[model samples]
Target: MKVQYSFEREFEELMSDLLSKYGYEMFQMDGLGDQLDVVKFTEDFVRRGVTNISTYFIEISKPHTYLYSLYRIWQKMKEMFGKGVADEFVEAQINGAVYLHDRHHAALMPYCFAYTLKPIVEKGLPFIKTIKSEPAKHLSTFIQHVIQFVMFASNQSSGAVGLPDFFVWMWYFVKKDLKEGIIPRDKLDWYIEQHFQILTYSLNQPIRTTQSPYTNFTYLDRNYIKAIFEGERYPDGSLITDHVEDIIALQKHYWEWVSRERERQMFTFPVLTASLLYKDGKFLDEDSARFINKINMKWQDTNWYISDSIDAVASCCEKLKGRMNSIGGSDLNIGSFKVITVNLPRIALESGGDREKYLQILRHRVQLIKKALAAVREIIKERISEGLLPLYENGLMLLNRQYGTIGVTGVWESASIMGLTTEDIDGLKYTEEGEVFVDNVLDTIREEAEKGYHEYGFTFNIEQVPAEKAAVTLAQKDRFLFGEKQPFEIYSNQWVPLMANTDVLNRIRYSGKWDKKVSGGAILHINLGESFKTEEESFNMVKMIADMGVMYFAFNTKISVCEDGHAFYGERCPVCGKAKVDEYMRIVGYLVPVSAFNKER
Candidate 1:
């Protein structure tokens, strides 16, 4: 192809300068020497005004077979360009700035179902009217329509595309009641049940109703953080490498590219979740703390979750054992552990305000959990044996090493239903009497977890984490069910709930006490809304948290990004006018643009 772009000459000149800067003489015998025809490869991009000339270098390296090509490119650059320049060049190519990983011509793209479905809903009652009369039959049709749109929109891409739990519920609400002015009190519970049923059905179904291969279920994997931070080992137990910072940087780049590659090839569903597992009190170490800061900066644009808890893994192991035993024995085959969350408040409510009843309710639920675990174990075993699950054909070895969580959300609300005082519920300020009551709740959960572990070798621990979207949806359902107004309208996003009026430091200290009991991992979120004026102040608060033995916590603050894509750590964008900026903040497990969040969040 002829280099006909207006910037073709400029791009060549820029590339030549970059090459010389890295000590590579373009036409030298030992250098590129026309072997890397950068201009020819990148003329198309240059014509489209893409100035980052390094992209051509990445593009020409085809197939990437086990990253051999990438390694060779780095090796060549290191020989001529030196380590510093070579690293920078590779980072530029891997990062999603100039060229994204395009192994099969796809790129990792973010898909928010809320945003995707907004226009469809806002286009007004055309679709809803079709389904309003015979909702059961027509609802399926409407949902199929949604699936088609999502599949089309997600064509040739892979990455975390959030399931539209909240949106689906909203659509149900709008179609059933909102458009008709008021909800019939009698049909409320049935409506809520139907909403949940539809979501559950959709999640488990294959891509198309008749498709043989099911869709992949992906989530933010926090284990990656642990693997990189502590140095990953091979299955044979040999250390991969212990170079912490370097490993972290490389892991981040590699995973990001892998996600893009998967998207490109339409290979697998990609849920790129980054988790930082900082052990309690470990943040006191200067290097560890510095790395935390570095990771935060590096993954600023990615989905990151931070947790601290010494007993998390222990709890997970216990839960896994019970689940394993419930099936048959430790030899029972399973591919991976899928988290099943329980609505603690609903369970408590079913107890009808009796303490003993609540405990019994939990015990019954535990048995149900065990049965479900066993069923899944059998299914996985069958799948692997039939060569249906390639990822788990190796006896689910990867899952065996990892912890499967049995998430419990709304513990605070559950406690309240069981007659715990409001002060204890909101502030975690348990008096002597209140303490005993709270202990009963924790004791029941711990006992079940222990029973599963001791009897079945299943590692199950109770997590206080709420299903963020589910919490909101259930709250709306609760209002309809009880027909009563609650003091705190919205359910909490964290495992341990904190009142808006509670003392921040006191809440942190008190929540830390509960962290030890919730072995499945609990987060103490500190919403520092414009509180700290400087980074030093933020550091000091983190230090205090470390000193307090808080297992895991995250600082939530508002960040605004300008129209020109410059992010600022405040309400206002410094580079662009307020009207031209978008705000983003963390909501439970993910960071979302503020405009995308519904009022409940």
Candidate 2:
């Protein structure tokens, strides 16, 4: 009687279903099928150390998510890797050896999308519910269609939608307006203001939840400007680089509005990017540099992308490698399919610093990950056929290019346990030997990922998992299973622990060391204890950090918002009392209220 997931339960379920079918009045027939085995499944889930429930509104959808998790986590996985083969997978996830990120939507959804607006811009949005809209001949329609397309695409995928060449495409609409006298070129203040207002405010709205939507755009800075003039054109056959000032103004206005809007009320969507090109003794685009410098003086959420040898090329955290992977012209229209975050600390903790043992366990976990992601690929295929992938069905997304990622959390903890790290004068960091071990671990995973491509005919990349919730969950399981008193001790989702005492230079170098190995989603953060005194000093930080070899990096700072709608840096807002204020951090890639964050991340 005191059981969870037993053969006895299966017999009972069968008997009940038989009785009910015979009109013998048995109430326990859940109708969820044999392999499904819902009664046992629900009990097993409740008894285990995992959950997909993101809400406390228990009476409403708690049971609902359980059933969904049953299907997505158990049934789909079973289908992917037969019931018998899935045993190790189930046990591993439950025991904190690996994590299947976003299990509720794992099979049904691809992780995120980086799509082109070409489909939306060239033709009306296709396969939507309402009467299909037409091509955007006007700027307003162009903006509207683009937003609608993104919104629909956002709903289809699990993560963000990247517009890596956003401004380039939009400039055509701007040019059309200019040439046709839609708004006087000399008095274009209100025109830019009106359209961008619609764009930002609409995007920032709660389409999903407190932070429903996630998106990003590349701000083609001076580095891009230098390269664009050589060979770049719009859909309309004019030089995209020719209207330099207009494109610059459009991008600048976005920041001004985003900055101003956060003051009114904090909303986080849109990861802005600007790749700095370090040239002969200086960075380029003085006007652009000064404007970016102006914004960063008071606010700096911008992702300072490091150009490849001072030339522009790029995409998001799950980086779209270069011009080669665009959904449109020379930008991204791709995203990761799924993430299986392998637990690194567990490997270290279990293996007791046995390097071979760690790799052995890691390789197996990655093997499981590859199969699961292949199943995810199959799921997406089936779903597209069944109409779940509406955007992909409509020909907007690059289904062929999406990655199935192998993410890792707790590299620092793995090193710490293996005695690879030492407490330095500044703080804890990888010792000389530790750095070597860490490199080995990352590269080994990289090698396996490459093998995944060769052996299975699908792509894989390693990432420092943004272990937002997974970090908290994995730590809890480790502490519980190991019987440790340190419940607060957590895994590092970043290259190093966020709160580590390592210096900025070391942080840059250490994080960059794994860049080649981390071929998928990876990002480095420059968390300044104190900000630079001057804008030029802040600007110089980009070149210096880039020189150290961090390909994608951002300057991270905490911003607090008051219930009264006032926002400022640090914990306490100047105008709002402590009780009325809430601080926010990048929970994943987007900022959300700390109160809404998973405990411990």
Candidate 3:
């Protein structure tokens, strides 16, 4: 009898539910207002910076003086908080809250700013300050400075009257703090505790939706607010860029205050979790537990501060098991499993020239990957030791490119204690009976490459179609076991080793040969949209290529590398058409088709 191992339907359902509970939703939420508008504006601004920096780094030899100047200007603009006036304006906003509403809103403005904008400009402050220590530092120094700024500005100002004075004070405070030292920990904590309690109280209370307030609300038109802070009045009406110093300042200030409050006192669950888990006094509800489990799997790809929280929860379960036992009347599970999975795209995209730098980044990334996998593995192992043979699966890295990268689709599976039978080990080999999976996948890459399409930029979108229906694509004789034809086939998931190795790229290129007769050449390679042509021309070209069943095509202009002639540029759509480089180069998608000939037929 043929034995099969796969993710149980119930297990899949449970994982999906858990991931959603952990704020791992498809649609992200955005709110309205100046601070938000500015933050958004900043996201655009900073992204441009990242893009520019990336480009500059790539083209290190060709220094564009104008672009360089512009980049500098943007950097200075972002650092505007170091200026006197800008610093004061932020201080005024921070300290002007009269009632609890005033303070909460004021606090929230910075908090939200910090949360949204920090990732763009300064990355972010990790929640757990140190991995080596228990009881890690509560907050980062950058965070602490902002807290003090908020506290000092709020306490000293009167109805936004001392805005300028507040700014001067803040500038002095920063200079002194940087040159001298931070405010006393006790003093800072006292103020934080006071404001936090008030803010927390206000957040928990139901809002009073009064038609009118006793005092006139200084209502600034949202657009006007954005225009002032985010440079809407400029000839180009610059949307926020990475170097918006003022915006960064606002975000920094707010992040400091809000993160502190949230960590020690606030009740926001980071996202909307199932009520069973969120409601007061409930032990982690089954739904919530399932949701957390799903999140653990989903977040396997990301390296963010949030993952630290997940780690902490697992650690707490282990260290405080005795306490947990008293509450639950049962032993708490603390064991986990460790599995190291590298990012395939990172591995695939390694260039010989940048091997040293790439290796450093890869080493760091792998370390994190190993850490995360170990965390999960350890927990799972503990569960197994405690009489629960937990199931574990990993999403392997698939595509690592220079700029744009993609990963393969992965689905988890649960197995009994008797895992990886002889059949399973043998199935990994292409020679095994009915095992055509690797060949089919290679063919897909070959077919796409031959056609000049690059499909290395897409993430696995599983829900786009039914897995069972998709699996049917794999049912033909001599067909690959994990080809796209066979939707939901587990063998498709085992290409991590191939993807990590450079041979995959070489094989793909070799397999995707242009007919020997055509133009005395095979399509060397597809450089999709890497062109400077008009949209109409680009669109027409794409249509024409697609019509011809050319699978992998690069869009950019081509350079003729003649055997004996000077190099000359060929036509490109985006650059020629004046398509914004930032927008056009934002996404790269490709598909790989298997190329096999049937001699008898």
Candidate 4:
């Protein structure tokens, strides 16, 4: 016998059933989600607008759930530690509570979520009224419906609910409320900051849940939870237990789950914990490295998460297991998940064949590697440039002044190197003797300073007043004489017009380095009104006010500016034009030190 059925269309079938039972026709509402538009109602009467009560209440209410969850966990932990309870007992309670709280929160979120409304109103009523007669009434009803649905949805309260997204949103709301002065910003900021620090630093540490066996019976010995939650001491600071060991165990737990290849998931916890810890510069053990490598490798094979970081991580673990660990070890050991494994020519094809495609699947993997390398380079450059490197003495390398030098060991310097490209190294030109290679480069940098080019000096100058009353001082012609009012531009003729003005020149001069080579004879553009003169004589003049060190002078000009205000008997005779142009008259004495400017260092 042949059977014909169309039971797969669950939604239509359910609607039919509901309509038949309730004797109500199925008619779609023109506007389904118009209740959320509280802003529109107040447009005509701003003073009579909705009190923004929901905003304030939601802000406060959202964190209440998380705070309560935290409080419950804290209570369990306190009982466990305070009462000297057994680990198993404390853990059981913790597990139970954590599971319920997480699930309840997740389920409740959808109910409270606001729905957008169409702006148009029909007939006498606002559009929102077509779908929801009252915003608050609709919201309350939906929340009730969701709670009822959840009660019937699952019997096992042990099932986990994803709450991280909700927690983040709650944090945003809390912050917004604090900032708007609905609540005190300081108290909220401090509270949220403290909470995040605790949660973030306690990554890899055992969670204090009501149901988990770890927290139930064996009391935590060192007051780890108390120190973080109450005393505000971070878990990584002055801790009794090895944070690394805890991380290692967590790493093992993650891999063990992968080895089982179970459909059930506890993956997000470990990955999030590890990521947070890593981002903050907290160290994890080799196990974490192994776990991450495995996850990355498997990700190449499966493409499980697509662009989702969490799923990709899980897949990485699987690949690592297959290639590196040989599917070996007591649930903790992770093997190689190297890029080559996914890229290499296969020995044989098996089930699921080769997943070479997944090797280059994620842009984030490469991006992360690059970011990490960049961070390392930044740290090293800062240390070296700041004279923080131990090999350097007294943090100052005055070319002529000698003192005990800070000595850097080969090992230390080696560690400082990062993301080195052959091109970067090739850029360095060594002298006839290789001995001068590094110093030559260093000396070249120093020499550039003497030439009046302030390498790596930039400033962000805010205008003296608000934009309502500011004016531009330099013209295109002026820009050519000195340098354009832009970063990393060479001095050109156009700046000269800008330089002719004494005030403009002064500001520009204060903002950039003087090029001793630009005008020969160490011609100093000192002070707003002073004319450029030979460095030999001008040095004394400048020194009378402030010492213009001889180190400031660079090259001799072929043309000399005579005391009679004539440029003659030089490279180019100033016969026709002798008056000071505003562009040339502008002061340009801003010479900030390299160490003071380059913030990236």
The lDDT of each candidate is 0.43, 0.65, 0.24, 0.23
Q: Tens-digit lDDT track for model 3 on 1-601?
A: 4334354364345335534543322112101122223345556555652033333332332222222322232233225323333222222211210001112222111100001111111322222234322211222333343333333322221111001111211222233343344546546545434543553343333222211111000111122123323432212233433224433343234334443443222232111111111112222223322322233231111010100012222231101111010001111121111111222222323322243353454444422322222222233334445642211111011011001111122211101011211223212212221123223323333332232223222111101011111122212211231233223222122212122222323323332332211111111123332332343543344334333332222322222222222222332222223221111110111111112101101
Clash numbers, per candidate: 19, 1, 76, 86
Top TM-score prediction, candidate number:
2
Per-residue lDDT of 1-601 in model 4, one digit per residue for the tens?
Answer: 4334232353335335544543321111111112123344334334543134433433334333543333333334334344222222222222211011121232221101011111101111122123433321222232333222222222222221111111212223343455567567547535544443343223323232211111000011112112212322211243323242442343344344343331211111212211211212222232343343344322111110000012212221101111111101101111110010010111011112222332232222222222222222233334456643321232111111111010001111111121111212322211233222222322332343232213222101100110010011111112222232222221211112223333433323422332221111111332234333443443233223222111121111122332233423333335544442211111111111122122211
Q: Candidate 1, residues 525-553: lDDT per residue as tens digits?
A: 67555555655665566667766666555
**What would the TM-scores of all predictions be?**
0.49, 0.81, 0.17, 0.15
Better of 3 and 4 by lDDT: 3
Best by lDDT: 2
Model 1 global lDDT (CA atoms, 0 to 1):
0.43
Q: For model 4, how big is the CA root-mean-square deviation?
A: 36.3
For model 3, give the 10-residue run with minimal summed lDDT. Answer: 322-331
RMSD to native for every prediction?
A: 29.1, 7.3, 29.9, 36.3
Ranking of predictions according to TM-score: 2, 1, 3, 4
Tens-digit lDDT track for model 2 on 504-557? Answer: 878888866776566425677677877787877886776677667676666776
